[PDB]
Amino acid sequence: LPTERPSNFFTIQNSPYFAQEKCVGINTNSTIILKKSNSDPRKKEAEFKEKNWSQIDKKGLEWQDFTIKIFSLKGDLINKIQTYLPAFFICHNF
RNA sequence: CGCCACUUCAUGGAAAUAAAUCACUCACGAAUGUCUU
16 A cells, blocks of 8 residues: 555455556556565555546546436336335446 | 456437418509591
């Protein structure tokens, strides 16, 4: 973990998401750059580059509670949506 | 823990449809109804 990061910046080290593996490494385009630490060999330390953080294709975003608005002039459609909406989100990922 | 990327870049439908297609006014008015030898 680089010990200089924005307060909203967090990492999931081992995840099934294996795209964007170049975001941590050697090249200057990487968001987090690993170089061999001084003194002791191995046990490299990481540096956070905010400029590369901005130009990342995908980010893991978690928000507070947010609203979903469904509009329909058909009352029976809305009431059927109300029954199935809690089940729909439980059964699906996005 | 180390190392490492490929793939995909628009199809289907609608392509004009109805309303009004000339309306009103003037449709001849005035002079001459014989004149001069």
